[PDB]
Design a protein around this nucleic acid. Structure first.
Ligand SMILES: [Mg+2]
Ligand SMILES: [Mg+2]
Ligand SMILES: [Mg+2]
Ligand SMILES: [Mg+2]
Ligand SMILES: [Mg+2]
Ligand SMILES: [Mg+2]
Ligand SMILES: [Mg+2]
Ligand SMILES: [Mg+2]
Ligand SMILES: [Mg+2]
Ligand SMILES: [Mg+2]
Ligand SMILES: [Mg+2]
Ligand SMILES: [Mg+2]
Ligand SMILES: [Mg+2]
Ligand SMILES: [Mg+2]
Ligand SMILES: [Mg+2]
Ligand SMILES: [Mg+2]
Ligand SMILES: [Mg+2]
Ligand SMILES: [Mg+2]
Ligand SMILES: [Mg+2]
Ligand SMILES: [Mg+2]
Ligand SMILES: [Mg+2]
Ligand SMILES: [Mg+2]
Ligand SMILES: [Mg+2]
Ligand SMILES: [Mg+2]
Ligand SMILES: [Mg+2]
Ligand SMILES: [Mg+2]
Ligand SMILES: [Mg+2]
Ligand SMILES: [Mg+2]
Ligand SMILES: [Mg+2]
Ligand SMILES: [Mg+2]
Ligand SMILES: [Mg+2]
Ligand SMILES: [Mg+2]
Ligand SMILES: [Mg+2]
Ligand SMILES: [Mg+2]
Ligand SMILES: [Mg+2]
Ligand SMILES: [Mg+2]
Ligand SMILES: [Mg+2]
Ligand SMILES: [Mg+2]
Ligand SMILES: [Mg+2]
Ligand SMILES: [Mg+2]
Ligand SMILES: [Mg+2]
Ligand SMILES: [Mg+2]
Ligand SMILES: [Mg+2]
Ligand SMILES: [Mg+2]
Ligand SMILES: [Mg+2]
Ligand SMILES: [Mg+2]
Ligand SMILES: [Mg+2]
Ligand SMILES: [Mg+2]
Ligand SMILES: [Mg+2]
Ligand SMILES: [Mg+2]
Ligand SMILES: [Mg+2]
Ligand SMILES: [Mg+2]
Lengths: 119, 121, 161, 154
RNA sequence: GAUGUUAGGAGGGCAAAUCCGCCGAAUUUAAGCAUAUAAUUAAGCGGAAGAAAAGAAAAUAACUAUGAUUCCUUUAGUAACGGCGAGUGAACAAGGACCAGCUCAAACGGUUAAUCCUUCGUUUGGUGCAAACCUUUCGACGGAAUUGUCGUUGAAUUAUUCCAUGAAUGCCUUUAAUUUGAGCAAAGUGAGCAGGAAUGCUUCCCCAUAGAGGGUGAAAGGCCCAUAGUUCUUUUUAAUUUAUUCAUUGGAAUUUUUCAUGUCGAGUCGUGUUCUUUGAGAUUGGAGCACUAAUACGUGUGAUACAUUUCACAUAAAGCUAAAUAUAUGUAGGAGACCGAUAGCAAACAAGUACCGUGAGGGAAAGAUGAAAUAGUACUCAGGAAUGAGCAAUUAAAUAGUACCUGAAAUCGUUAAGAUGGAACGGAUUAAGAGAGAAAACAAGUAAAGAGGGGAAU
RNA sequence: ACGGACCAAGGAGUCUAGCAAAUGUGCAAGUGUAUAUGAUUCUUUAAACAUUUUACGCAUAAUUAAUG
RNA sequence: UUGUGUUGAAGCGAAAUACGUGAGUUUUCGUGGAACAUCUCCCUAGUGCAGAUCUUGGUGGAAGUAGCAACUAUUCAAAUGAGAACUUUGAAGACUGAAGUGGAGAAGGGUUUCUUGUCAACUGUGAUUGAACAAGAGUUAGCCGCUCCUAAGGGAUAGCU
RNA sequence: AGCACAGUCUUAACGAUGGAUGUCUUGGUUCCUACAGCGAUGAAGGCCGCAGCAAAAUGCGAUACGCAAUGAAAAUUGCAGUGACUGAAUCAUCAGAAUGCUGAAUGUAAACUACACCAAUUCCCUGGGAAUAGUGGUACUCCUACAGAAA
């Protein structure tokens, strides 16, 4: 029934091995079901779940490795890029939006909107 | 009432009650604790668990104490040791009691319960 | 049409039902607006939301005699006050490039108003403590105690009306 | 207000005369029970109601400020007069003076219990009792629309 | 100029209530109809956003003048248009909401493009558990660009005063709000009656910053969840607290005093003519075509075509821009003098479902047992079985038996009573039947003694 | 002459705009606080309250195509 | 406003020495099983039905009536079964009459095929039958097709509108 | 053991039929407030799947009525089975992982699971050792940059 916290520590090969075993077990169960049996029909669900868990663990490991590989370097795969609503991606970064023509900037610096308490 | 984020609206309330998730159900099957228990812990009332020992107050069995057998969050009903009842068949099932109508005496107490008590304090 | 009644003039031959707005939102809208303004005020700690406007005479022969707040003060009036336009803008005062002065008296009045405003206002420093004199028009920055005192007193909004 | 096209969302048209059926618009097509049925029109099941209610009914009424003021004044006067108060239904027989005035100590009362006690002392015990009694569940469909209880006015 | 699966990127489709462009009817009204009207609407086609569009005067005024846009109140059903018929119909001012201004081009800087971008990098930081982010200035190697990037908003020159800036040492304080989820959360499960079961009724208690709402075997402030209230934590944004030394590049505003009188958007405006649109009238905007300008002493508005000329106001033919405003779309909340299952959305239910149509499309019906089926009909008899019956059985109740709450009428059955010669029923009037009935349709009190209840007097 | 086999439920002068008359009500040479603001206004409160320490409407004057 | 309700509300049914000229109101008994009034005043409206070849749903008389007559035709015995004119088997008698109710395919259908069950409805008489209902099963390709070619034609590329 | 003629019509009682009335109500409607776009990083829409016993809807996507993680937190239950004594049974949350075939659909096609061509691709172990015909890519228009040819 193997829960994830055990599996994080395992190396990828070991994980793969585990997964194959689980798959084999599942296949066996399926075969049994197909044949006139209902002894361990309900065992299958758990096995399936276990398999799923294993897959998840492995997938996340793989993703982490990928991320490590493509750390920085301007361009990246579009997977490892910031998946985010298209419009937002298109949109100008806040900094870009801010960026002021030099005269305007100067003006801002000189005559900023002051605080002035009226009495 | 005074905060207008919550709805008084009857319909809405009823929907919430009936269609609540499991956590909500658990929360709203609470029972009054006895005087002794109240004195012991600042708590007035608790969500009822399996091995608590309740005293029934309302219904046909206004008095029969017993260990809670099962709590069933679908129907909002606890069932109690000896509140037995034959069906038309003869099969002896437990009679359901809603936790309004019960007051819990002896307390099932795991770490979670302890934590809850501490929080209440 | 029948009987002795006004000849009917009801412009409802188009699909009028399509654009009827009923103002169920009025009072609530007003409340919301008020809230927003309060928020704005809070954000501008101590300083007034409202901006100085010059009094001006309304045009046309019929409103001639009446006086009301125009937008913006005219370069000449700013000059009289002893004030740069940019500086004025930065403070609470409106500037109007396109308005002109025909009447000396009017100009005098508005510069008087400006002067009064200047007298009223006390300037919070830009970077804390460091009290420095202004640029072109703006007055000096007062010290801390004075500022505190001013804060403790009520913020007068008599000039903005 | 009823939603705009209520009862008129159909494509229905009348078959006209020579079919031995009234000339109400009919739903077209086949297969359903709805096919061939009287469609829009106040008479028909699934029809539009007659003058469907609209948001642009006049809901509020302007009342002259002056009139309102006058009304307020008159109500105040009434509140003054013992007999009128009695008529209005309050159990005021044990209160001395009906322009009933109380010290500013009342404005500082912190606790409902205290307030209740004060009321009792005044003579309104009976009134309070009546109020307590008269929370009852409304007749009719108010019950279904958050108007569950009906309470007398103290 | 083609060409590339070159390196990097972008567009395409969905959705639409508000929104922006086109395109564009007719029913309708005129009691006919043709211009008008419907309507610069519907449909069609395209395009955006949380709003869009508009917007910083070639504006209005004729005043003591106002001063971008938008929106509201109004102006005003007014000026005006119109087979001057039907009907249509603004604008300025005034009062508010909200208020924000700007940068290209042109002028200027050649003792030098100062600009800009791609790729490759380099090394201080900040929050994060990571993931990512956040900024920091520094070069290269490419290109782009003199067919024009960047700075300046005339130019210098003086007096004043600001703003950036870098380093060392220093301070992460107190609150106020504001907005997320968080917990905590007062007082009866007291006697009696009647009930299957109180949340009921008489009665004794209390709590209430909580007597909203829901749940609970019947109406519950005190049984439960929540409610009033408060206690942290999340969001940001005000106030308050600590800055002090030393470096210098650079810029800004006003102020003197010199000299510069510059520049200001062309197949564009404009006129003609056509068509459209407008309230716009010898044409309001727009468009097609023809013709085609002027330089600020210019040209454009100043609602009657023109000339001659004043005066006022603007500075067209490039561009951007928050707010007030709208929202029948979607999602999420919250409300109701709304509807209550033939109503309300078409849809309370496995509803845009079933089903019909080749198809575009059309489009239903259908909720409720009980407190609890963890009470859904055991058992016995008769039956081929369905069912039926029970001395049997769940229930408070089964004529509440899952087609289940109530269970109307039409219609039909049973029984009884009555009538009955080609209608029936009805009205007015009695009668004879057959049912119900005593509150007017008799008997107050007094006496004897039973069963109750009250009130007072001391 | 037409409609009606029967029964149940549904089923038709309504709502807005603007005008008028009638009548009630307030105030009255005025009247209506319009938008909007303000409040120690905030379950109800989308109401109620308030009107800044010469707005506008209709009326108070008519008449003329008109300068008037 | 001042009340009634599980010592039984609304509703409904039948009534009543009932009241009202009348709309109605009121009460009794039964059923019913939870709400209900307010006429104290006035507020509000999707407010009152016999008709509309009204709508919707239901139910009648017609009426146990019309009718269940194309395709020449059935009969006997036995079995199965609660039950057999129309299920099965046998024996007769017949018909289709290779332009066939015969074999194969296309379109269309979509599991109707098949076995085992099986009868609530349906199979307009019956029914144990069934193309119904339920449970399972069943479609095997290098060669049979599609897949490739082009046809009448279609949709596009370039442009051009 | 007897006696009512039958039918038609009427009334009452007690039933059938039907679903009115009344009572409800996880639904609608309206108004108010608030935010407000999804998509070549493959959208909406459509198919096909996915449960031990599984049709619909609901949820999900070959990890398929769910995985991880977080916050609850002892059950889930028709049976089978799985769990507790807290990453576990179940809820909510949902940011990680994953997301079949399509569809703008985009390699050509389309009543095709038809067909190209270019990369062979993928995994494991610290440069080898394993797999699988599997996996990607290739649309049109456009932009910047580069390329070597054209006038
Ligand atoms: Mg309807
Ligand atoms: Mg009612
Ligand atoms: Mg598009
Ligand atoms: Mg006509
Ligand atoms: Mg006509
Ligand atoms: Mg005609
Ligand atoms: Mg359109
Ligand atoms: Mg814009
Ligand atoms: Mg306007
Ligand atoms: Mg007027
Ligand atoms: Mg028009
Ligand atoms: Mg009940
Ligand atoms: Mg110009
Ligand atoms: Mg026109
Ligand atoms: Mg003018
Ligand atoms: Mg411009
Ligand atoms: Mg623009
Ligand atoms: Mg409906
Ligand atoms: Mg009872
Ligand atoms: Mg009954
Ligand atoms: Mg009921
Ligand atoms: Mg029934
Ligand atoms: Mg005869
Ligand atoms: Mg005739
Ligand atoms: Mg006729
Ligand atoms: Mg007829
Ligand atoms: Mg009829
Ligand atoms: Mg009048
Ligand atoms: Mg009633
Ligand atoms: Mg009606
Ligand atoms: Mg009716
Ligand atoms: Mg009728
Ligand atoms: Mg009639
Ligand atoms: Mg009918
Ligand atoms: Mg019939
Ligand atoms: Mg047959
Ligand atoms: Mg023959
Ligand atoms: Mg023959
Ligand atoms: Mg067969
Ligand atoms: Mg048959
Ligand atoms: Mg068979
Ligand atoms: Mg079948
Ligand atoms: Mg072949
Ligand atoms: Mg070919
Ligand atoms: Mg061809
Ligand atoms: Mg073509
Ligand atoms: Mg007889
Ligand atoms: Mg968008
Ligand atoms: Mg998990
Ligand atoms: Mg956990
Ligand atoms: Mg393709
Ligand atoms: Mg083909």
């Amino acid at each position: 029934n193997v829960k994830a916290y055990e599996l994080r520590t395992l190396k990828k090969k070991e994980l793969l091995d585990k997964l194959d075993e689980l798959k084999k077990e599942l296949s066996g169960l399926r075969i049994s079901k197909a044949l006139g049996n209902s002894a361990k029909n309900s065992k299958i669900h758990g096995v399936r779940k276990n398999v799923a868990r294993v897959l998840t663990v492995y997938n996340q490991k793989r993703k982490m490795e990928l991320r490590q590989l493509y750390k920085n370097k301007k361009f990246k795969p579009y997977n490892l890029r910031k998946k985010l609503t298209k419009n937002k991606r298109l949109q100008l970064s806040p900094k870009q939006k801010a960026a002021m023509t030099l005269r305007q900037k100067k003006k801002v610096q000189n005559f900023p909107q002051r605080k002035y308490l009226v009495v | 009432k005074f905060n207008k984020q919550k709805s008084s609206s009857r319909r809405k309330m009823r929907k919430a009650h009936f269609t609540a998730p499991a956590g909500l159900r658990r929360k709203i099957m609470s029972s009054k604790l006895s005087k002794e228990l109240r004195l012991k812990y600042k708590t007035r009332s608790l969500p009822v668990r399996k091995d608590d020992e309740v005293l029934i107050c309302r219904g046909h069995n206004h008095g029969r104490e017993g260990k809670v057998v099962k709590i069933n969050r679908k129907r909002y009903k606890i069932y109690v040791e000896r509140v037995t009842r034959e069906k038309v068949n003869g099969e002896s099932t437990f009679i359901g009691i809603h936790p309004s109508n019960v007051v819990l005496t002896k307390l099932k107490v795991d770490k979670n319960r302890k934590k809850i008590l501490d929080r209440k304090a | 049409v029948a009987h002795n009644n006004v000849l009917p003039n009801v412009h409802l031959h188009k699909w009028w039902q399509r654009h009827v707005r009923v103002n169920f939102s009025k009072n609530i809208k007003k409340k919301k607006r008020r809230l927003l303004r309060e928020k704005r005020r809070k954000a501008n700690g101590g300083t007034p939301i409202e901006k100085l406007h010059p009094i001006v005479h309304c045009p046309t022969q019929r409103y001639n005699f009446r006086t009301r707040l125009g937008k913006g003060f005219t370069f000449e009036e700013l000059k009289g006050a002893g004030l740069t336009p940019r500086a004025a803008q930065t403070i609470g005062i409106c500037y109007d490039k396109r308005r002109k002065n025909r009447s000396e008296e009017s100009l005098t009045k508005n510069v008087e108003r400006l002067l009064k405003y200047k007298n009223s206002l006390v300037m919070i420093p830009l970077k804390k403590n460091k009290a420095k004199k202004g640029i072109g028009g703006i007055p000096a920055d007062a010290d801390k105690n004075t500022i505190k005192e001013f804060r403790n007193k009520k913020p007068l909004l008599s000039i903005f009306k | 207000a009823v939603k705009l096209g209520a009862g008129y969302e159909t494509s229905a048209e009348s078959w006209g005369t020579g079919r031995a059926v009234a000339r109400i618009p009919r739903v077209p097509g086949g297969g359903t029970h709805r096919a061939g049925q009287g469609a829009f029109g106040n008479m028909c099941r699934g029809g539009g109601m007659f003058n469907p209610t609209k948001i642009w009914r006049r809901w509020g009424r302007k009342v002259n400020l002056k009139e309102k003021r006058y009304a307020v004044c008159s109500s105040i006067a009434a509140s003054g007069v013992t007999s009128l108060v009695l008529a209005r239904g309050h159990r005021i027989s044990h209160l001395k003076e009906v322009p009933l005035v109380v010290s500013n100590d009342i404005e500082s009362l912190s606790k409902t219990k205290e307030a209740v006690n004060f009321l009792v002392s005044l003579g309104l015990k009976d009134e309070v009792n009546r109020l307590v009694k008269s929370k009852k569940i409304r007749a009719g469909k108010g019950k279904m629309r958050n108007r569950k209880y009906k309470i007398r006015n103290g």
